[PDB]
Every structure is written in C-alpha cells, then in structure tokens.
Amino acid sequence: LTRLILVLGDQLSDDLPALRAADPAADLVVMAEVMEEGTYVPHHPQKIALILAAMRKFARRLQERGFRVAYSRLDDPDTGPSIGAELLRRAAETGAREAVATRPGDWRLIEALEAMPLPVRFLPDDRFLCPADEFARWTEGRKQLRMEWFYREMRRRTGLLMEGDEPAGGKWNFDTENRKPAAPDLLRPRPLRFEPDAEVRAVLDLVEARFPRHFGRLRPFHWATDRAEALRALDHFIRESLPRFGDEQDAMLADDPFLSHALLSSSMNLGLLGPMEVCRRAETEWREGRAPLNAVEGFIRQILGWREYVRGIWTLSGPDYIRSNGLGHSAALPPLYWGKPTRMACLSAAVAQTRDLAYAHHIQRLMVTGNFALLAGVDPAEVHEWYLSVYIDALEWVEAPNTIGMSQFADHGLLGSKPYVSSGAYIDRMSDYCRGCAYAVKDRTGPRACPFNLLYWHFLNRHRARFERNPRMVQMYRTWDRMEETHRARVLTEAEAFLGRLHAGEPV
Ligand SMILES: Cc1cc2nc3c(=O)[nH]c(=O)nc-3n(C[C@H](O)[C@H](O)[C@H](O)COP(=O)(O)OP(=O)(O)OC[C@H]3O[C@@H](n4cnc5c(N)ncnc54)[C@H](O)[C@@H]3O)c2cc1C
Ligand SMILES: Cc1nc2c(=O)[nH]c(=O)nc-2n(C[C@H](O)[C@H](O)[C@H](O)CO)c1C
Ligand code: SF4
Ligand SMILES: [Gd]
Ligand SMILES: [Mg+2]
C-alpha cells in the first residue's frame, strides 16, 4: 500500500503536485543525489553544489512537515548510479508497486523513468502560469508562433498590468525604452550574496573532490540554497534594482557583471520561487509609484512572456528538438568557451564571469557568446552542451529553446524570425568593452578588424539563399550590394582566414 513519491532536485516546492498526492502516513518520499544527473553534462560545480545543498535542506524540511524521507547521498557508497536505480532499491525495501512523479523538464530523464521496470504515475508540473494543455490549445492552427501574441494573452488571463481590458499605461510593450547603454553609478546597488553555512560547505567540499574536471570555479559560492534566502533575494531586487531594470536591460559594463538584473533564475527554476509571486510584487511597485512602468513591464514580460513561452516550446517540440540543425552548422566549440584566453574583450569578459560566478546576464548570452557561436558556425549541439553545462540556472526545459531557437536559429523560427547576430557596432554601442580591446571595432578589414565585423557578413553571405527571402533581413543585403566588389572579396577572404585560425584552436 506504500507508494514511492519522487522529488527531483528541481522540484523543491512545498506544493509540488507529487507531494500533494502523497499520504504522509503511508507513502515514502524518495530523493537521490546521483552521478548520472551530475554528469549527463559536465555541470558547473556551482550548479551541482546548489542543487545538492538545496536538496538536503528541502529533505529536512519535508521531515519537519511530517513526511517520511528516504534520502540517498552522493557520498554514500550504497547510492546507485541513477534516479531509477534508487527508485527500484526503495521499491524493494518497501514493497511499493508504483512511484508517483511530477513530470521533469528533461527528455532524457523522462525516458529513463518510463523505461524503468517500475510503473511511474506522472503528474503535470503546475508551477507555470500557463498550463501545458492550454499552451497547446493556444498554438493550434497557427502557422507561425510569436512570443508577443502569447504574452498579451497571458497578460489578459492573469490580469497582470491590466486596467480593465486595457494594458497599463496605454500600450502593451515597452522594450523600445529598454535599449540604452549604462554608466557606472555610485547609487547602483549590487545584488545580494549569501554565505554558505556548514551544511552547504560540506556539499562544496564534496563537489570539489567528486567533479574536479568540470569547467568552473566553485568558490566563492554565493547563491540562495533555500526558500528563506530566495525570498530575501526577491525583496532585495524589488526594492533596490527593479526601478533600473528597464533602462539597463541590454547594457554591458566591463566592471559590473550584474548591473540591475535580478539573479533569481536559479531560485525560480529549482522551485524556491514561483513566477506569480514574483510578477505580482513587481506590479505593486508600479501601482505605488516606486518603479517606472517600462521597468516593471519589462521585468514581467521576461517571466510571464518568455519564460512561459520557452517552456511551452520545449514541451511541444519533444525529445528531438536538440537535434535541430536548420542552418547545417557543424564546427567545434572554440576553446575560449572553456576558459582559454582570447583577445576579444567582450567574449573574454563573458566567459570569465561564467567561469567565476556561474552567471552571465541575458544580453551576454544572446549578443556576445551566442552571437559569436552562430556567426562562427558552431554546431548547435555543441552550443547546447555549453549553455546547459555552464550557467547556474540551466536545465533542459529553459536552456534548450533559448539556445537552439532564440540564439542559434537552428529550429523553425519559433523564438524570433530574425537571427540575433551582429557586427561589432552593436557591442560597441551597448557596452564599454571596445576601448579596452586589442581589436578595432571601427575597422571593417585589416589585421585589427573586430571579428564580429568579418563574421557578420560572412554569415549573411553564406546563408543568402535562405535569408534573402526573409522580409526582415532584405535590407541588410541591400547594404552589402552597394559596396565595391573588392571590399566584399577582402571581407570574405579575411573572415575565412579568421575562421581557419578559430577552429584550429589558435588564440584569437
Ligand atoms: C543562449 C541562452 C541561454 C539561456 N539559458 C537559460 C537557462 O538555462 N536558464 C534560464 O533560466 N534562463 C536562460 N536564458 C534566459 C536568460 O538569459 C536568463 O533567464 C537570465 O539571464 C537569468 O538571469 P536573471 O535572474 O538575472 O534574469 P533577469 O534579467 O533579472 O530577468 C528576470 C527573470 O526573467 C526570466 N527570463 C528572462 N529572460 C528569459 C528567457 N529568455 N527565458 C526564460 N526566462 C527568462 C528569468 O526567470 C529571470 O530570472 C538563456 C538565454 C540565452 C540567450
Ligand atoms: C546536477 C543535478 N543533480 C541532481 C541529482 O543529483 N538528483 C536530482 O534529483 N536532480 C539533480 N539535478 C536536477 C535534475 O537533473 C532535474 O530534474 C532535471 O535536470 C530537470 O528536471 C541536477 C541538475
Ligand atoms: S572590438 Fe569586437 S571583439 Fe573587441 S570588445 Fe568590441 S565587439 Fe568585442
Ligand atoms: Gd547534429
Ligand atoms: Mg531586449
């Protein structure tokens, strides 16, 4: 009569569907720290540490609430290699004939649990604002998807920034106001960091010993490891940084890795925060004249729009999504991505902070590291491995669409009809990187030519047949055509030379 109740490491929510369905008197909660989940990609040590530590804390909390918990520690030699091995073990110990599980957000894990010779009753993950079945319904018959239309509908369903049947402040979307560079500022707060207690430190010591060859600096470790801490991170952001969120959303500063971003993605993704509570707090700040509407709406749109939309695309696209390669790109990831030196200031900055903090803000992920990998023709499978490995907040469901779709343009165009690529001019306008860089951003050719200046046109040229039949990009080819033929030839000869060095592993 005992049933197993699985709680995975991204399911640390009090009101998790599986827990709702359990009988604390009869059922056994099962949690397991296992090598398979620690190595399916070589996760940033900070990520591994975050999950294991939050797992232990949550297990103890489940005990405080009355559940019986069977917890398999990574450092127990009795622990098996996978979530499945531990479910089976506990079935044997217990007599249970069935496990209940909130459906995870990783296709490989889904399949593993189905393949397990123990039946699993899956429940939907209801921690999103848009239910799966409702996302599917909204998309049906649409020959083209666009996040914006989905977002407006989510605004209406939820009531967020809605004054009647009208959007707050008389228009829907304020992204046009959120695209300026930012200045250094004494009055700009730094986000809240958290010191590990002894139990987190025990996990840090474990991860250092057990996963030494993964890319990333483990210490200092500063992320929230339970709900109490995450709520403080929330409060900090709402009070101190939300009013700048809009003006500074696309900015980059060589000396500030965080600017005014919330640094909440990991907390939301593991279940420590929920999106409604986050969006509502932000809305209140507008209603009380503390945060401007471009800021609050910009913030909400990232969670209510993109986060939700991305989850939907993941769900619909299935287990073969990560095999998408619409542009036929096949190059290795350059060594600079795993920390080898590069003279490109922007990339260096981004990879360095990814190494050290397990965190890059959105515009870095999209327009620096993402943009460069696309321009250089890296296989999207390789880009996908990297983003899913290196960031504190990375799990398949949220990383895959952002990486394969939004950034690498490898899919059907569901996350943007125009690829996010640029020349160096864009990085120059939005950051202060270029003055410190050995490359010359204003040079279109020559030994000092910014590599984005070469690869941008090379990219457009090599994919002209497909992109020129694309309204939103016809202009760019017009500008290319109006240039002397010898200038074009030189640009391509030089991009080609660069690419040869890049993909040979030469420092660039
Ligand atoms: C190539 C690529 C890979 C990405 N991988 C991840 C990932 O693994 N995990 C992840 O949570 N986000 C991912 N993103 C989206 C976004 O970059 C991060 O969510 C954001 O950087 C998290 O930092 P923050 O908390 O400071 O976010 P903020 O800038 O403060 O934004 C606020 C919140 O909005 C949400 N958000 C904003 N953009 C997105 C997005 N496009 N998709 C989903 N949520 C969004 C997050 O919950 C975030 O906490 C990726 C984006 C790109 C381009
Ligand atoms: C590194 C890691 N380790 C574990 C683990 O040891 N045990 C566990 O239950 N979950 C872990 N996770 C999170 C899962 O991989 C997660 O459920 C999927 O990545 C997405 O739902 C991760 C990411
Ligand atoms: S010149 Fe080019 S490579 Fe150097 S920081 Fe600017 S955009 Fe990056
Ligand atoms: Gd492939
Ligand atoms: Mg933007």
Short mmCIF file of N, CA and C in Angstrom, two decimals, residues 302-402:
data_model
loop_
_atom_site.label_atom_id
_atom_site.label_comp_id
_atom_site.label_asym_id
_atom_site.label_seq_id
_atom_site.Cartn_x
_atom_site.Cartn_y
_atom_site.Cartn_z
N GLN A 302 9.64 39.26 -19.26
CA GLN A 302 10.63 38.21 -19.26
C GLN A 302 10.09 36.94 -18.58
N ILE A 303 9.18 37.07 -17.61
CA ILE A 303 8.73 35.88 -16.84
C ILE A 303 7.39 35.35 -17.34
N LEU A 304 6.46 36.28 -17.53
CA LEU A 304 5.11 35.98 -17.95
C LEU A 304 5.12 35.63 -19.44
N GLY A 305 6.02 36.25 -20.20
CA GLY A 305 6.10 36.04 -21.65
C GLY A 305 7.14 35.00 -21.98
N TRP A 306 8.40 35.38 -21.96
CA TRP A 306 9.45 34.49 -22.42
C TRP A 306 9.62 33.17 -21.66
N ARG A 307 9.75 33.26 -20.34
CA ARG A 307 9.90 32.06 -19.54
C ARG A 307 8.79 31.06 -19.84
N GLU A 308 7.53 31.52 -19.82
CA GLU A 308 6.37 30.65 -20.11
C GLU A 308 6.39 30.10 -21.53
N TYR A 309 6.62 30.98 -22.48
CA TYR A 309 6.69 30.63 -23.91
C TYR A 309 7.76 29.59 -24.20
N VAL A 310 8.95 29.82 -23.65
CA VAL A 310 10.03 28.88 -23.76
C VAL A 310 9.64 27.53 -23.20
N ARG A 311 8.94 27.46 -22.09
CA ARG A 311 8.54 26.17 -21.54
C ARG A 311 7.56 25.47 -22.46
N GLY A 312 6.70 26.24 -23.08
CA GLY A 312 5.74 25.69 -24.00
C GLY A 312 6.40 25.13 -25.24
N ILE A 313 7.33 25.88 -25.80
CA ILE A 313 8.01 25.40 -26.99
C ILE A 313 8.77 24.12 -26.69
N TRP A 314 9.31 24.03 -25.49
CA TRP A 314 10.05 22.85 -25.11
C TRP A 314 9.11 21.66 -25.10
N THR A 315 7.97 21.83 -24.46
CA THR A 315 7.02 20.77 -24.28
C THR A 315 6.52 20.27 -25.61
N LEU A 316 6.17 21.18 -26.50
CA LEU A 316 5.67 20.75 -27.81
C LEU A 316 6.72 20.16 -28.69
N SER A 317 7.97 20.57 -28.54
CA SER A 317 8.97 20.24 -29.57
C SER A 317 9.54 18.86 -29.37
N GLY A 318 9.39 18.35 -28.16
CA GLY A 318 9.78 16.97 -27.88
C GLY A 318 11.27 16.66 -27.82
N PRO A 319 11.59 15.38 -27.70
CA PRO A 319 12.91 14.84 -27.49
C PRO A 319 13.90 14.97 -28.63
N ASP A 320 13.42 15.37 -29.79
CA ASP A 320 14.30 15.52 -30.96
C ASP A 320 14.64 16.97 -31.22
N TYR A 321 14.12 17.88 -30.40
CA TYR A 321 14.37 19.31 -30.56
C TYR A 321 15.87 19.61 -30.59
N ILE A 322 16.61 19.09 -29.61
CA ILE A 322 18.05 19.31 -29.54
C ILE A 322 18.83 18.75 -30.71
N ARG A 323 18.18 18.08 -31.64
CA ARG A 323 18.87 17.62 -32.86
C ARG A 323 18.72 18.58 -34.03
N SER A 324 17.95 19.65 -33.82
CA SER A 324 17.71 20.62 -34.84
C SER A 324 18.99 21.27 -35.35
N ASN A 325 19.12 21.33 -36.67
CA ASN A 325 20.26 21.97 -37.28
C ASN A 325 19.88 22.54 -38.63
N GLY A 326 18.90 23.42 -38.59
CA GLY A 326 18.39 24.06 -39.78
C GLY A 326 19.38 24.78 -40.67
N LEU A 327 20.51 25.25 -40.11
CA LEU A 327 21.49 26.01 -40.89
C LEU A 327 22.70 25.18 -41.32
N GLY A 328 22.70 23.91 -40.92
CA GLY A 328 23.76 22.98 -41.28
C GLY A 328 25.12 23.29 -40.71
N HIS A 329 25.16 23.83 -39.51
CA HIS A 329 26.39 24.26 -38.89
C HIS A 329 26.99 23.07 -38.13
N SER A 330 28.32 22.93 -38.18
CA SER A 330 28.96 21.70 -37.69
C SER A 330 30.33 21.85 -37.03
N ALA A 331 30.76 23.06 -36.73
CA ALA A 331 32.09 23.28 -36.21
C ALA A 331 32.09 22.99 -34.71
N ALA A 332 33.27 22.64 -34.21
CA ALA A 332 33.52 22.50 -32.79
C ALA A 332 33.33 23.82 -32.08
N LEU A 333 33.13 23.76 -30.77
CA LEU A 333 33.11 24.99 -29.97
C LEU A 333 34.55 25.44 -29.81
N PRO A 334 34.85 26.73 -30.03
CA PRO A 334 36.19 27.19 -29.78
C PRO A 334 36.61 27.05 -28.32
N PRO A 335 37.89 26.75 -28.06
CA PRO A 335 38.47 26.56 -26.74
C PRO A 335 38.31 27.72 -25.77
N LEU A 336 38.19 28.92 -26.31
CA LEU A 336 37.90 30.09 -25.48
C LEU A 336 36.63 29.91 -24.70
N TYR A 337 35.70 29.14 -25.20
CA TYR A 337 34.48 28.95 -24.43
C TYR A 337 34.69 28.22 -23.12
N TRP A 338 35.70 27.35 -23.05
CA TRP A 338 36.01 26.67 -21.80
C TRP A 338 37.15 27.34 -21.03
N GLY A 339 37.36 28.63 -21.28
CA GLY A 339 38.31 29.38 -20.48
C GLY A 339 39.68 29.67 -21.06
N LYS A 340 39.99 29.21 -22.27
CA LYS A 340 41.28 29.58 -22.87
C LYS A 340 41.28 31.06 -23.26
N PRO A 341 42.45 31.69 -23.24
CA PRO A 341 42.49 33.15 -23.45
C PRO A 341 42.04 33.63 -24.81
N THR A 342 41.41 34.78 -24.82
CA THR A 342 41.05 35.39 -26.05
C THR A 342 41.22 36.89 -25.98
N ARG A 343 41.62 37.45 -27.11
CA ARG A 343 41.88 38.87 -27.22
C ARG A 343 40.62 39.65 -27.43
N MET A 344 39.52 38.96 -27.67
CA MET A 344 38.23 39.63 -27.83
C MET A 344 37.67 39.99 -26.45
N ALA A 345 37.62 41.28 -26.15
CA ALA A 345 37.36 41.71 -24.79
C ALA A 345 35.99 41.23 -24.35
N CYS A 346 34.98 41.45 -25.18
CA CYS A 346 33.61 41.05 -24.87
C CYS A 346 33.49 39.56 -24.51
N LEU A 347 34.04 38.69 -25.35
CA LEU A 347 33.97 37.26 -25.09
C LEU A 347 34.74 36.86 -23.83
N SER A 348 35.90 37.46 -23.68
CA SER A 348 36.72 37.22 -22.55
C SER A 348 35.96 37.56 -21.28
N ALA A 349 35.36 38.74 -21.24
CA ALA A 349 34.59 39.17 -20.08
C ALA A 349 33.47 38.16 -19.78
N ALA A 350 32.74 37.74 -20.80
CA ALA A 350 31.58 36.90 -20.60
C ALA A 350 31.99 35.52 -20.10
N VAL A 351 32.99 34.92 -20.77
CA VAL A 351 33.43 33.61 -20.37
C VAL A 351 34.06 33.69 -19.00
N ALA A 352 34.82 34.73 -18.72
CA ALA A 352 35.44 34.85 -17.38
C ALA A 352 34.37 34.86 -16.26
N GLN A 353 33.27 35.57 -16.47
CA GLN A 353 32.28 35.67 -15.40
C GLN A 353 31.45 34.43 -15.29
N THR A 354 31.22 33.77 -16.43
CA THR A 354 30.61 32.47 -16.45
C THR A 354 31.47 31.50 -15.66
N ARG A 355 32.78 31.54 -15.88
CA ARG A 355 33.68 30.70 -15.10
C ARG A 355 33.57 30.95 -13.62
N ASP A 356 33.63 32.22 -13.25
CA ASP A 356 33.79 32.60 -11.87
C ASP A 356 32.48 32.68 -11.11
N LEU A 357 31.40 33.12 -11.72
CA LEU A 357 30.18 33.35 -10.99
C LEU A 357 29.04 32.38 -11.38
N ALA A 358 29.28 31.57 -12.41
CA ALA A 358 28.26 30.71 -12.98
C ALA A 358 27.08 31.53 -13.51
N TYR A 359 27.34 32.76 -13.98
CA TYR A 359 26.28 33.64 -14.37
C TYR A 359 26.71 34.67 -15.42
N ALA A 360 25.91 34.78 -16.48
CA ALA A 360 26.04 35.87 -17.45
C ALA A 360 24.63 36.41 -17.61
N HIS A 361 24.43 37.73 -17.67
CA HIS A 361 23.07 38.20 -17.91
C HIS A 361 22.66 38.02 -19.39
N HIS A 362 21.36 38.18 -19.63
CA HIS A 362 20.77 37.81 -20.88
C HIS A 362 21.48 38.32 -22.16
N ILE A 363 21.82 39.60 -22.20
CA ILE A 363 22.35 40.16 -23.43
C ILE A 363 23.72 39.61 -23.73
N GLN A 364 24.42 39.17 -22.70
CA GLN A 364 25.72 38.49 -22.90
C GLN A 364 25.46 37.12 -23.54
N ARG A 365 24.49 36.39 -23.00
CA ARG A 365 24.19 35.07 -23.50
C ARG A 365 23.74 35.12 -24.99
N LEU A 366 22.97 36.15 -25.32
CA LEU A 366 22.39 36.30 -26.65
C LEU A 366 23.37 36.97 -27.60
N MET A 367 23.78 38.20 -27.28
CA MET A 367 24.56 39.01 -28.22
C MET A 367 26.09 38.93 -28.10
N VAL A 368 26.65 38.29 -27.08
CA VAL A 368 28.08 38.08 -27.10
C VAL A 368 28.45 36.65 -27.40
N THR A 369 28.21 35.73 -26.46
CA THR A 369 28.66 34.35 -26.62
C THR A 369 27.81 33.63 -27.62
N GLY A 370 26.50 33.86 -27.58
CA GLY A 370 25.56 33.27 -28.54
C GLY A 370 25.79 33.76 -29.94
N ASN A 371 25.79 35.07 -30.10
CA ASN A 371 26.01 35.72 -31.37
C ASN A 371 27.30 35.18 -31.99
N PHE A 372 28.39 35.13 -31.25
CA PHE A 372 29.67 34.66 -31.81
C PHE A 372 29.65 33.21 -32.28
N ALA A 373 29.00 32.33 -31.53
CA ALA A 373 28.97 30.92 -31.89
C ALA A 373 28.19 30.67 -33.21
N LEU A 374 27.13 31.45 -33.40
CA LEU A 374 26.32 31.38 -34.61
C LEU A 374 27.11 31.90 -35.80
N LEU A 375 27.69 33.08 -35.65
CA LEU A 375 28.49 33.66 -36.71
C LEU A 375 29.63 32.74 -37.13
N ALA A 376 30.13 31.92 -36.22
CA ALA A 376 31.30 31.10 -36.47
C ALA A 376 30.92 29.71 -36.93
N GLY A 377 29.62 29.45 -37.00
CA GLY A 377 29.13 28.20 -37.48
C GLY A 377 29.33 27.02 -36.57
N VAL A 378 29.31 27.23 -35.28
CA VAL A 378 29.45 26.11 -34.36
C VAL A 378 28.19 25.24 -34.48
N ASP A 379 28.39 23.95 -34.47
CA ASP A 379 27.26 23.02 -34.33
C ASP A 379 26.36 23.39 -33.15
N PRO A 380 25.08 23.54 -33.40
CA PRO A 380 24.22 23.90 -32.25
C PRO A 380 24.20 22.87 -31.13
N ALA A 381 24.46 21.61 -31.45
CA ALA A 381 24.57 20.57 -30.42
C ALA A 381 25.71 20.94 -29.44
N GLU A 382 26.75 21.58 -29.97
CA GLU A 382 27.89 21.99 -29.16
C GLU A 382 27.60 23.23 -28.35
N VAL A 383 26.83 24.14 -28.91
CA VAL A 383 26.45 25.33 -28.19
C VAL A 383 25.53 24.93 -27.04
N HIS A 384 24.68 23.97 -27.31
CA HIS A 384 23.69 23.48 -26.39
C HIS A 384 24.36 22.80 -25.24
N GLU A 385 25.41 22.04 -25.50
CA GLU A 385 26.12 21.37 -24.42
C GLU A 385 26.69 22.42 -23.48
N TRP A 386 27.16 23.53 -24.04
CA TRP A 386 27.86 24.54 -23.24
C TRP A 386 26.90 25.30 -22.34
N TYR A 387 25.82 25.82 -22.92
CA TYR A 387 24.88 26.61 -22.14
C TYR A 387 24.19 25.75 -21.07
N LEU A 388 24.02 24.46 -21.33
CA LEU A 388 23.33 23.62 -20.39
C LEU A 388 24.31 23.26 -19.31
N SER A 389 25.59 23.27 -19.64
CA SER A 389 26.59 22.98 -18.60
C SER A 389 26.85 24.17 -17.68
N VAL A 390 27.06 25.36 -18.25
CA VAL A 390 27.83 26.36 -17.51
C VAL A 390 27.08 27.31 -16.64
N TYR A 391 25.77 27.50 -16.83
CA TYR A 391 25.06 28.54 -16.08
C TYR A 391 24.28 28.00 -14.92
N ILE A 392 24.26 28.75 -13.82
CA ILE A 392 23.70 28.30 -12.55
C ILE A 392 22.24 27.88 -12.68
N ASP A 393 21.57 28.47 -13.66
CA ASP A 393 20.13 28.33 -13.85
C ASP A 393 19.75 27.39 -14.99
N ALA A 394 20.71 26.62 -15.50
CA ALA A 394 20.48 25.80 -16.72
C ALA A 394 19.89 24.42 -16.43
N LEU A 395 18.72 24.20 -17.02
CA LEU A 395 18.10 22.87 -17.16
C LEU A 395 17.51 22.78 -18.55
N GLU A 396 17.36 21.57 -19.07
CA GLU A 396 16.91 21.42 -20.46
C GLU A 396 15.71 22.28 -20.86
N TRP A 397 14.67 22.28 -20.05
CA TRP A 397 13.44 22.91 -20.50
C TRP A 397 13.62 24.40 -20.80
N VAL A 398 14.47 25.10 -20.06
CA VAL A 398 14.62 26.54 -20.24
C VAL A 398 15.81 26.88 -21.12
N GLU A 399 16.88 26.11 -21.00
CA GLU A 399 18.05 26.35 -21.83
C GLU A 399 17.84 26.00 -23.31
N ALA A 400 17.17 24.89 -23.59
CA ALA A 400 17.20 24.35 -24.95
C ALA A 400 16.55 25.31 -25.96
N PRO A 401 15.39 25.87 -25.65
CA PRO A 401 14.78 26.75 -26.61
C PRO A 401 15.51 28.05 -26.79
N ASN A 402 16.03 28.59 -25.69
CA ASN A 402 16.81 29.82 -25.75
C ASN A 402 18.04 29.62 -26.62
#
